[PDB]
Design a binder for these strands. Structure first.
Lengths: 146, 195, 49, 48
DNA sequence: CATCCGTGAGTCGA
DNA sequence: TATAATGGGAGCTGTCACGGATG
Protein backbone atom coordinates (compact mmCIF):
# COMPACT_ATOMS: atom_id res chain seq x y z
CA UNK A 1 0.00 0.00 0.00
CA UNK A 2 2.60 2.55 1.13
CA UNK A 3 5.34 2.90 -1.48
CA UNK A 4 8.88 4.03 -0.70
CA UNK A 5 8.59 6.71 -3.39
CA UNK A 6 5.77 8.53 -1.58
CA UNK A 7 7.58 8.31 1.76
CA UNK A 8 10.52 10.13 0.19
CA UNK A 9 8.32 12.44 -1.90
CA UNK A 10 6.42 13.60 1.19
CA UNK A 11 9.49 14.72 3.15
CA UNK A 12 10.84 16.36 -0.03
CA UNK A 13 7.81 18.64 -0.25
CA UNK A 14 7.43 19.32 3.49
CA UNK A 15 11.10 20.21 3.88
CA UNK A 16 10.85 22.89 1.16
CA UNK A 17 9.40 26.26 2.21
CA UNK A 18 7.14 28.18 -0.17
CA UNK A 19 7.73 31.82 -1.10
CA UNK A 20 4.37 33.06 0.16
CA UNK A 21 4.65 34.43 3.70
CA UNK A 22 1.04 33.50 4.38
CA UNK A 23 1.50 29.94 3.13
CA UNK A 24 4.71 29.42 5.12
CA UNK A 25 2.84 30.33 8.31
CA UNK A 26 -0.06 28.04 7.46
CA UNK A 27 2.43 25.21 6.91
CA UNK A 28 4.11 25.75 10.27
CA UNK A 29 0.84 25.43 12.20
CA UNK A 30 -0.09 22.16 10.52
CA UNK A 31 2.67 20.42 12.46
CA UNK A 32 1.16 20.52 15.95
CA UNK A 33 -1.77 18.14 16.41
CA UNK A 34 -5.18 19.37 17.54
CA UNK A 35 -6.09 18.78 21.17
CA UNK A 36 -8.44 16.16 22.58
CA UNK A 37 -11.08 17.29 25.06
CA UNK A 38 -9.33 15.63 28.00
CA UNK A 39 -5.85 16.51 26.74
CA UNK A 40 -6.84 20.17 27.05
CA UNK A 41 -7.75 19.57 30.69
CA UNK A 42 -4.30 18.16 31.43
CA UNK A 43 -2.41 21.22 30.20
CA UNK A 44 -4.85 23.46 32.05
CA UNK A 45 -4.09 21.51 35.21
CA UNK A 46 -0.37 21.84 34.50
CA UNK A 47 -0.40 25.57 33.76
CA UNK A 48 -2.39 26.28 36.93
CA UNK A 49 0.28 24.42 38.90
CA UNK A 50 2.99 26.17 36.92
CA UNK A 51 1.29 29.55 37.21
CA UNK A 52 1.08 29.11 40.98
CA UNK A 53 4.58 27.91 41.79
CA UNK A 54 5.51 31.20 40.17
CA UNK A 55 3.18 33.35 42.27
CA UNK A 56 4.77 31.83 45.37
CA UNK A 57 8.38 32.71 44.60
CA UNK A 58 7.42 36.08 43.12
CA UNK A 59 6.30 37.56 46.45
CA UNK A 60 9.08 35.69 48.27
CA UNK A 61 11.80 37.54 46.36
CA UNK A 62 10.57 40.93 47.59
CA UNK A 63 10.17 39.85 51.22
CA UNK A 64 13.54 38.09 51.34
CA UNK A 65 13.69 34.45 52.41
CA UNK A 66 13.90 31.57 49.94
CA UNK A 67 13.24 27.82 49.81
CA UNK A 68 15.91 25.15 50.43
CA UNK A 69 17.92 23.58 47.59
CA UNK A 70 15.58 20.59 47.38
CA UNK A 71 12.31 22.54 47.47
CA UNK A 72 13.25 25.47 45.21
CA UNK A 73 14.51 23.07 42.54
CA UNK A 74 11.33 21.00 42.73
CA UNK A 75 9.36 24.25 42.77
CA UNK A 76 11.34 25.60 39.82
CA UNK A 77 10.55 22.59 37.64
CA UNK A 78 6.81 23.07 37.99
CA UNK A 79 7.47 26.64 36.92
CA UNK A 80 9.31 25.40 33.82
CA UNK A 81 6.80 22.65 33.08
CA UNK A 82 3.97 25.14 33.54
CA UNK A 83 5.42 27.78 31.24
CA UNK A 84 6.23 24.92 28.89
CA UNK A 85 2.65 23.67 28.99
CA UNK A 86 1.45 27.21 28.27
CA UNK A 87 3.50 27.37 25.07
CA UNK A 88 1.92 24.07 24.02
CA UNK A 89 -1.73 25.04 24.44
CA UNK A 90 -1.11 28.11 22.28
CA UNK A 91 0.66 26.23 19.48
CA UNK A 92 -2.16 23.66 19.39
CA UNK A 93 -5.15 25.96 19.05
CA UNK A 94 -3.08 28.17 16.78
CA UNK A 95 -5.34 26.94 14.00
CA UNK A 96 -8.37 28.31 15.81
CA UNK A 97 -7.15 31.90 15.45
CA UNK A 98 -6.49 31.55 11.74
CA UNK A 99 -9.97 30.06 11.30
CA UNK A 100 -11.90 33.17 12.27
CA UNK A 101 -9.34 35.78 11.24
CA UNK A 102 -9.89 34.98 7.58
CA UNK A 103 -13.41 36.38 7.87
CA UNK A 104 -12.07 39.86 8.55
CA UNK A 105 -9.99 39.98 5.38
CA UNK A 106 -10.56 42.79 2.89
CA UNK A 107 -11.18 45.42 5.56
CA UNK A 108 -8.10 47.63 5.26
CA UNK A 109 -6.01 45.39 7.49
CA UNK A 110 -3.69 42.59 6.40
CA UNK A 111 -4.52 38.91 6.86
CA UNK A 112 -1.23 38.35 8.66
CA UNK A 113 -1.82 41.40 10.84
CA UNK A 114 -5.22 39.88 11.61
CA UNK A 115 -3.87 36.46 12.59
CA UNK A 116 -1.21 38.02 14.80
CA UNK A 117 -3.60 40.23 16.76
CA UNK A 118 -5.84 37.17 16.87
CA UNK A 119 -2.94 35.18 18.29
CA UNK A 120 -2.40 38.03 20.75
CA UNK A 121 -5.93 37.51 22.03
CA UNK A 122 -5.36 33.76 22.20
CA UNK A 123 -2.50 34.40 24.61
CA UNK A 124 -4.72 36.34 27.02
CA UNK A 125 -7.39 33.67 26.59
CA UNK A 126 -5.20 30.83 27.81
CA UNK A 127 -4.21 32.74 30.96
CA UNK A 128 -7.75 33.12 32.28
CA UNK A 129 -8.91 29.66 31.19
CA UNK A 130 -10.64 27.60 33.88
CA UNK A 131 -10.79 23.82 33.64
CA UNK A 132 -13.26 23.54 36.51
CA UNK A 133 -16.10 24.24 34.09
CA UNK A 134 -16.53 21.30 31.71
CA UNK A 135 -16.34 23.70 28.77
CA UNK A 136 -13.84 22.93 26.02
CA UNK A 137 -11.00 25.36 25.34
CA UNK A 138 -12.47 26.16 21.94
CA UNK A 139 -15.45 28.10 23.27
CA UNK A 140 -13.87 30.48 25.79
CA UNK A 141 -11.03 31.07 23.33
CA UNK A 142 -13.25 32.16 20.45
CA UNK A 143 -14.89 35.00 22.38
CA UNK A 144 -11.42 36.21 23.32
CA UNK A 145 -9.91 36.03 19.83
CA UNK A 146 -12.86 37.84 18.25
CA UNK B 1 14.60 42.91 16.25
CA UNK B 2 17.15 43.48 13.46
CA UNK B 3 15.97 43.36 9.81
CA UNK B 4 18.01 43.23 6.60
CA UNK B 5 18.06 46.08 4.11
CA UNK B 6 16.36 44.63 1.04
CA UNK B 7 18.57 46.63 -1.32
CA UNK B 8 21.67 44.52 -0.65
CA UNK B 9 19.86 41.18 -0.51
CA UNK B 10 17.49 40.88 -3.46
CA UNK B 11 19.51 43.23 -5.65
CA UNK B 12 21.46 41.16 -8.19
CA UNK B 13 24.17 40.13 -7.73
CA UNK B 14 23.21 39.60 -4.05
CA UNK B 15 25.79 41.69 -2.22
CA UNK B 16 25.15 39.89 1.06
CA UNK B 17 25.35 36.48 -0.57
CA UNK B 18 28.66 37.45 -2.15
CA UNK B 19 29.98 38.68 1.18
CA UNK B 20 29.28 35.56 3.23
CA UNK B 21 29.73 33.17 0.29
CA UNK B 22 26.06 32.32 0.72
CA UNK B 23 23.60 31.34 -1.98
CA UNK B 24 20.93 33.93 -2.87
CA UNK B 25 18.43 31.08 -2.60
CA UNK B 26 19.81 29.86 0.74
CA UNK B 27 20.01 33.40 2.14
CA UNK B 28 16.25 33.64 1.66
CA UNK B 29 15.41 30.61 3.78
CA UNK B 30 17.40 32.20 6.61
CA UNK B 31 16.27 35.84 6.69
CA UNK B 32 12.60 35.01 6.20
CA UNK B 33 12.66 32.21 8.74
CA UNK B 34 12.52 29.05 6.61
CA UNK B 35 15.79 27.53 7.80
CA UNK B 36 18.13 27.78 10.78
CA UNK B 37 21.72 28.85 10.16
CA UNK B 38 24.71 27.68 12.21
CA UNK B 39 26.22 30.82 13.67
CA UNK B 40 29.12 29.52 15.76
CA UNK B 41 30.50 26.29 17.18
CA UNK B 42 32.85 25.29 19.98
CA UNK B 43 35.08 22.99 17.93
CA UNK B 44 37.57 22.40 20.73
CA UNK B 45 34.89 21.18 23.16
CA UNK B 46 33.50 19.07 20.32
CA UNK B 47 36.94 17.57 19.95
CA UNK B 48 37.58 17.11 23.66
CA UNK B 49 34.34 15.14 23.95
CA UNK B 50 34.30 13.64 20.46
CA UNK B 51 35.57 10.27 21.66
CA UNK B 52 32.95 9.95 24.38
CA UNK B 53 30.08 11.21 22.24
CA UNK B 54 30.81 8.67 19.54
CA UNK B 55 30.60 5.86 22.09
CA UNK B 56 27.24 7.14 23.27
CA UNK B 57 25.81 7.51 19.77
CA UNK B 58 27.06 4.00 18.96
CA UNK B 59 25.25 2.31 21.87
CA UNK B 60 22.01 3.95 20.79
CA UNK B 61 22.56 2.55 17.31
CA UNK B 62 23.22 -0.93 18.69
CA UNK B 63 20.17 -0.75 20.99
CA UNK B 64 18.13 0.04 17.87
CA UNK B 65 19.73 -2.83 15.97
CA UNK B 66 19.28 -5.22 18.90
CA UNK B 67 15.52 -4.62 19.17
CA UNK B 68 15.13 -4.93 15.40
CA UNK B 69 16.76 -8.37 15.36
CA UNK B 70 14.73 -9.52 18.36
CA UNK B 71 11.47 -8.13 17.01
CA UNK B 72 12.12 -9.81 13.67
CA UNK B 73 12.98 -13.10 15.37
CA UNK B 74 9.69 -13.20 17.28
CA UNK B 75 7.76 -12.50 14.07
CA UNK B 76 9.54 -15.31 12.23
CA UNK B 77 8.65 -17.55 15.17
CA UNK B 78 4.95 -16.74 14.92
CA UNK B 79 5.02 -16.82 11.12
CA UNK B 80 6.22 -20.42 11.12
CA UNK B 81 3.98 -21.26 14.08
CA UNK B 82 0.86 -19.91 12.36
CA UNK B 83 1.68 -21.54 9.01
CA UNK B 84 1.73 -24.83 10.93
CA UNK B 85 -1.35 -23.97 12.99
CA UNK B 86 -3.23 -23.41 9.73
CA UNK B 87 -1.67 -26.70 8.63
CA UNK B 88 -3.14 -28.53 11.64
CA UNK B 89 -6.48 -27.02 10.61
CA UNK B 90 -5.95 -28.69 7.23
CA UNK B 91 -6.49 -25.49 5.25
CA UNK B 92 -5.64 -25.37 1.55
CA UNK B 93 -1.91 -24.94 0.88
CA UNK B 94 -2.66 -21.90 -1.28
CA UNK B 95 -4.43 -20.36 1.72
CA UNK B 96 -1.10 -20.63 3.53
CA UNK B 97 0.57 -18.54 0.83
CA UNK B 98 -1.53 -15.57 1.91
CA UNK B 99 -0.20 -16.03 5.44
CA UNK B 100 3.37 -16.53 4.24
CA UNK B 101 3.42 -13.35 2.15
CA UNK B 102 1.64 -11.60 5.01
CA UNK B 103 4.54 -12.36 7.33
CA UNK B 104 7.20 -11.37 4.80
CA UNK B 105 5.47 -8.04 4.20
CA UNK B 106 5.29 -7.46 7.95
CA UNK B 107 8.96 -8.32 8.53
CA UNK B 108 9.84 -5.98 5.67
CA UNK B 109 8.09 -3.03 7.30
CA UNK B 110 9.83 -3.74 10.61
CA UNK B 111 13.28 -3.72 9.02
CA UNK B 112 12.53 -0.55 7.08
CA UNK B 113 11.07 1.20 10.13
CA UNK B 114 14.20 0.30 12.05
CA UNK B 115 16.39 1.33 9.12
CA UNK B 116 14.80 4.79 8.88
CA UNK B 117 15.62 5.24 12.56
CA UNK B 118 19.23 4.23 11.93
CA UNK B 119 19.40 6.50 8.89
CA UNK B 120 18.14 9.40 10.98
CA UNK B 121 20.66 8.64 13.72
CA UNK B 122 23.21 8.49 10.90
CA UNK B 123 22.26 11.87 9.47
CA UNK B 124 22.19 13.25 13.00
CA UNK B 125 25.71 12.11 13.86
CA UNK B 126 27.04 13.06 10.42
CA UNK B 127 25.65 16.57 10.77
CA UNK B 128 27.15 17.24 14.21
CA UNK B 129 30.59 15.92 13.30
CA UNK B 130 30.75 18.21 10.27
CA UNK B 131 29.01 21.22 11.77
CA UNK B 132 30.39 24.70 11.10
CA UNK B 133 29.36 28.34 10.57
CA UNK B 134 27.27 29.23 7.50
CA UNK B 135 25.58 25.83 7.46
CA UNK B 136 21.82 25.70 6.84
CA UNK B 137 19.72 23.08 8.56
CA UNK B 138 16.47 23.49 6.68
CA UNK B 139 15.03 20.37 8.31
CA UNK B 140 13.76 21.46 11.72
CA UNK B 141 13.31 18.03 13.29
CA UNK B 142 16.91 17.11 12.66
CA UNK B 143 17.77 20.47 14.17
CA UNK B 144 15.41 19.95 17.07
CA UNK B 145 17.07 16.60 17.59
CA UNK B 146 20.41 18.24 17.00
CA UNK B 147 19.99 20.97 19.60
CA UNK B 148 18.94 18.56 22.33
CA UNK B 149 21.72 16.06 21.68
CA UNK B 150 24.64 18.51 21.43
CA UNK B 151 23.13 21.95 22.07
CA UNK B 152 25.98 22.65 24.46
CA UNK B 153 28.37 22.60 21.51
CA UNK B 154 27.03 25.09 18.95
CA UNK B 155 25.08 28.34 18.53
CA UNK B 156 21.97 27.92 16.40
CA UNK B 157 20.00 30.97 15.34
CA UNK B 158 17.53 32.03 12.67
CA UNK B 159 16.32 35.07 10.78
CA UNK B 160 17.69 38.52 10.08
CA UNK B 161 19.56 38.80 13.37
CA UNK B 162 21.49 35.58 12.77
CA UNK B 163 22.72 37.21 9.56
CA UNK B 164 23.88 40.07 11.73
CA UNK B 165 25.99 37.68 13.81
CA UNK B 166 27.72 36.26 10.74
CA UNK B 167 28.67 39.79 9.73
CA UNK B 168 30.04 40.41 13.21
CA UNK B 169 32.30 37.34 13.28
CA UNK B 170 33.30 38.06 9.72
CA UNK B 171 37.02 38.62 9.19
CA UNK B 172 37.30 40.84 6.13
CA UNK B 173 41.11 40.70 5.96
CA UNK B 174 41.16 36.90 6.16
CA UNK B 175 38.35 36.39 3.64
CA UNK B 176 40.01 38.91 1.32
CA UNK B 177 43.32 37.08 1.05
CA UNK B 178 41.52 33.73 0.86
CA UNK B 179 39.92 34.94 -2.36
CA UNK B 180 43.13 36.36 -3.82
CA UNK B 181 44.65 32.90 -3.44
CA UNK B 182 41.85 31.44 -5.56
CA UNK B 183 42.53 34.22 -8.05
CA UNK B 184 46.20 33.22 -8.13
CA UNK B 185 44.97 29.76 -9.11
CA UNK B 186 44.48 29.49 -12.86
CA UNK B 187 41.20 27.54 -12.66
CA UNK B 188 38.68 29.71 -14.49
CA UNK B 189 35.23 28.87 -13.15
CA UNK B 190 36.33 29.20 -9.53
CA UNK B 191 38.37 32.30 -10.35
CA UNK B 192 35.32 33.95 -11.90
CA UNK B 193 33.18 33.68 -8.78
CA UNK B 194 36.19 34.66 -6.67
CA UNK B 195 36.94 37.68 -8.85
CA UNK C 1 -4.70 2.80 -24.72
CA UNK C 2 -1.87 5.32 -25.15
CA UNK C 3 -0.32 3.08 -27.79
CA UNK C 4 -3.73 2.62 -29.46
CA UNK C 5 -4.98 6.19 -29.78
CA UNK C 6 -1.69 7.95 -30.55
CA UNK C 7 0.23 5.06 -32.10
CA UNK C 8 -0.09 6.29 -35.68
CA UNK C 9 2.70 8.74 -34.91
CA UNK C 10 6.33 8.02 -34.04
CA UNK C 11 6.52 11.16 -31.90
CA UNK C 12 4.01 9.73 -29.41
CA UNK C 13 5.63 6.30 -29.45
CA UNK C 14 8.89 8.10 -28.66
CA UNK C 15 7.10 9.98 -25.89
CA UNK C 16 5.57 6.99 -24.10
CA UNK C 17 9.00 5.35 -24.37
CA UNK C 18 11.03 8.20 -22.84
CA UNK C 19 8.34 8.25 -20.13
CA UNK C 20 10.02 8.45 -16.72
CA UNK C 21 7.58 6.53 -14.51
CA UNK C 22 4.50 4.38 -15.02
CA UNK C 23 1.50 3.86 -12.72
CA UNK C 24 -1.73 5.74 -12.06
CA UNK C 25 -0.55 6.52 -8.52
CA UNK C 26 2.95 7.52 -9.64
CA UNK C 27 1.60 9.95 -12.24
CA UNK C 28 -0.72 11.88 -9.91
CA UNK C 29 2.00 12.13 -7.26
CA UNK C 30 4.45 13.32 -9.90
CA UNK C 31 2.14 16.05 -11.21
CA UNK C 32 1.28 17.04 -7.65
CA UNK C 33 4.97 17.28 -6.75
CA UNK C 34 5.59 19.76 -9.56
CA UNK C 35 2.46 21.89 -9.18
CA UNK C 36 2.44 22.58 -5.45
CA UNK C 37 5.75 21.87 -3.69
CA UNK C 38 5.65 22.36 0.08
CA UNK C 39 2.53 20.30 0.71
CA UNK C 40 2.04 16.65 1.80
CA UNK C 41 1.22 14.41 -1.22
CA UNK C 42 -1.66 12.06 -0.40
CA UNK C 43 -3.01 9.72 -3.09
CA UNK C 44 -6.32 11.46 -2.33
CA UNK C 45 -5.00 15.03 -2.44
CA UNK C 46 -3.48 14.70 -5.92
CA UNK C 47 -6.59 13.03 -7.33
CA UNK C 48 -8.63 15.93 -5.95
CA UNK C 49 -6.96 19.04 -7.39
CA UNK D 1 4.17 51.85 4.66
CA UNK D 2 5.64 53.59 7.68
CA UNK D 3 2.45 52.95 9.62
CA UNK D 4 2.64 49.30 8.61
CA UNK D 5 6.12 48.80 10.08
CA UNK D 6 5.54 50.51 13.41
CA UNK D 7 2.31 48.60 13.99
CA UNK D 8 4.13 45.31 13.54
CA UNK D 9 7.33 46.41 15.25
CA UNK D 10 5.35 47.39 18.34
CA UNK D 11 3.45 44.14 18.23
CA UNK D 12 6.74 42.30 18.38
CA UNK D 13 7.62 44.17 21.55
CA UNK D 14 4.39 43.09 23.24
CA UNK D 15 4.84 39.47 22.23
CA UNK D 16 8.37 39.27 23.61
CA UNK D 17 7.18 40.52 27.00
CA UNK D 18 4.42 37.91 26.88
CA UNK D 19 7.05 35.26 26.17
CA UNK D 20 4.99 34.03 23.25
CA UNK D 21 5.92 30.70 21.65
CA UNK D 22 8.70 30.95 19.06
CA UNK D 23 6.26 29.95 16.35
CA UNK D 24 4.26 33.13 16.91
CA UNK D 25 7.23 35.37 17.64
CA UNK D 26 9.07 34.30 14.49
CA UNK D 27 6.03 34.92 12.34
CA UNK D 28 5.94 38.53 13.51
CA UNK D 29 9.66 38.97 12.86
CA UNK D 30 9.14 37.69 9.32
CA UNK D 31 6.29 40.15 8.82
CA UNK D 32 8.46 42.97 10.14
CA UNK D 33 11.16 41.95 7.66
CA UNK D 34 8.78 42.22 4.72
CA UNK D 35 7.18 45.41 6.05
CA UNK D 36 10.49 47.28 6.09
CA UNK D 37 11.34 45.67 2.76
CA UNK D 38 8.03 46.69 1.25
CA UNK D 39 8.75 50.20 2.49
CA UNK D 40 12.27 50.34 1.07
CA UNK D 41 11.37 48.65 -2.20
CA UNK D 42 7.87 47.47 -3.04
CA UNK D 43 7.37 44.49 -5.35
CA UNK D 44 11.10 43.72 -5.22
CA UNK D 45 10.58 40.59 -3.19
CA UNK D 46 7.20 38.91 -3.39
CA UNK D 47 3.96 40.49 -4.55
CA UNK D 48 3.66 44.25 -4.00
C1' DC E 1 25.54 28.99 -27.28
C1' DA E 2 20.59 28.85 -24.78
C1' DT E 3 17.16 29.84 -19.75
C1' DC E 4 15.56 33.10 -15.35
C1' DC E 5 15.21 37.89 -13.10
C1' DG E 6 15.38 42.65 -13.50
C1' DT E 7 15.27 46.76 -16.45
C1' DG E 8 14.79 49.41 -20.03
C1' DA E 9 11.12 51.13 -24.11
C1' DG E 10 10.44 59.99 -27.88
C1' DT E 11 8.51 64.98 -26.51
C1' DC E 12 5.10 68.92 -25.63
C1' DG E 13 0.00 69.19 -24.42
C1' DA E 14 -5.02 67.88 -23.14
C1' DT F 1 -15.18 37.45 27.94
C1' DA F 2 -17.43 30.00 29.22
C1' DT F 3 -22.49 25.37 24.28
C1' DA F 4 -18.83 24.31 20.57
C1' DA F 5 -16.26 26.18 17.14
C1' DT F 6 -9.34 24.62 15.07
C1' DG F 7 -4.70 24.78 7.64
C1' DG F 8 -6.35 31.11 2.59
C1' DG F 9 -7.80 32.37 -1.72
C1' DA F 10 -7.42 34.90 -5.89
C1' DG F 11 -4.74 34.16 -9.19
C1' DC F 12 -4.40 36.69 -14.81
C1' DT F 13 -3.42 35.85 -18.91
C1' DG F 14 -1.26 39.29 -26.24
C1' DT F 15 5.71 41.81 -25.29
C1' DC F 16 10.42 42.81 -26.23
C1' DA F 17 15.48 42.78 -26.41
C1' DC F 18 19.42 42.30 -23.24
C1' DG F 19 23.08 41.11 -19.66
C1' DG F 20 24.48 38.00 -15.89
C1' DA F 21 24.33 33.83 -13.42
C1' DT F 22 23.50 28.57 -14.54
C1' DG F 23 23.73 25.06 -17.87
Amino acid sequence: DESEALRQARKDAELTASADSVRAYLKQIGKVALLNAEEEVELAKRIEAGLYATQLMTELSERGEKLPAAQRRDMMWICRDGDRAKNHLLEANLRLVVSLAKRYTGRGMAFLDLIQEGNLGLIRAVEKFDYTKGYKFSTYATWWIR
Amino acid sequence: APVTHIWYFKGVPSRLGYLLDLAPKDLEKIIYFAAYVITSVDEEMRHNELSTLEAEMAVERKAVEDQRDGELEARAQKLEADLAELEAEGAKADARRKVRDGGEREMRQIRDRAQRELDRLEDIWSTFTKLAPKQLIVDENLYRELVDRYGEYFTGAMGAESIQKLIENFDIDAEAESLRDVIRNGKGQKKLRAL
Amino acid sequence: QIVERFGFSEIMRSTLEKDNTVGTDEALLDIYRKLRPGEPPTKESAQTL
Amino acid sequence: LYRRVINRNNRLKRLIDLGAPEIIVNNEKRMLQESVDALFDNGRRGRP
